[PDB]
Amino acid sequence: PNRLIVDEAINEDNSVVSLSQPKMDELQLFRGDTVLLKGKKRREAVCIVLSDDTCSDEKIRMNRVVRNNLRVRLGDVISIQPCPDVKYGKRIHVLPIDDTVEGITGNLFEVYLKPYFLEAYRPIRKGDIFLVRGGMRAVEFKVVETDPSPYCIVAPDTVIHCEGEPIKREDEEE
């Protein structure tokens, strides 16, 4: 019932997944609720849930970034549940993935992170990998640390910092 089949995104961004309204009613979810998704390799994601009048009841629409964080492919099954009491973050540390920032010399906060999170109130989990468009090439980042942990909402006063050596792609899951 809360096990749903992974389907393609239409407009969903990295922070949202969509269910049919009948499924939302069955699971007693409100549009805008934070949900915790469980996928392969014991991976989790936290997203906002929206309803989609083109989603099939047994399916959940989620973009490539969310599927990758959950280590799932189209057609895999995940579970969805409410994720209550996610608090606003005080401070988060994110680092870029090496092979995406080679040759990119700019202020990654100004170019990529500030506009990605700006007034967006995104839910995030320690260990998430997310993709941000910007500047000269899209860059991927990993959430290495959050306070509170492992879940928070990146609110306007959450301090986002990125300083440090980029993460090797081979270490995404560490």
Same domain, yes or no: 92 and 174? yes
CA 163 to chain centre: 21
Residue after which a domain boundary falls, among 62, 85, 108 = 85
- What is the tally of structural domains in the chain? 2
Cα distances (angstroms) measured from residue 17 to each of 28, 40, 108, 114:
16, 17, 27, 23
Resolution rounded to one decimal, in angstroms? 1.8
Characterize 21-41 residue by residue with b for buried, 16 or more Cβ atoms within 10 angstroms of its Cβ, and e for exposed.
eebbeebebeeebbbbbbbee
CA–CA distance, 134 with 142 (Å, rounded to integer): 16
Sign of the dihedral defined by the CA atoms of residues 23, 27, 30, 33, in that order: negative
Amino acid at site 127: G
Pair (90, 164) in one structural domain: yes
* Elucidation technique: X-ray
Measured CA distances, 89 to 41, 126, 140, 147 (Å): 26, 11, 20, 6
Q: Which of 40, 63, 85 is where one domain is finished?
A: 85
Structural domain harbouring 129 = 86-174
Q: What CATH number corresponds to the domain at position 55?
A: 2.40.40.20
State whether 32 and 91 are in the same domain: no
d(CA 158, CA 156): 6
The 3-state DSSP class for residue 148 equals coil
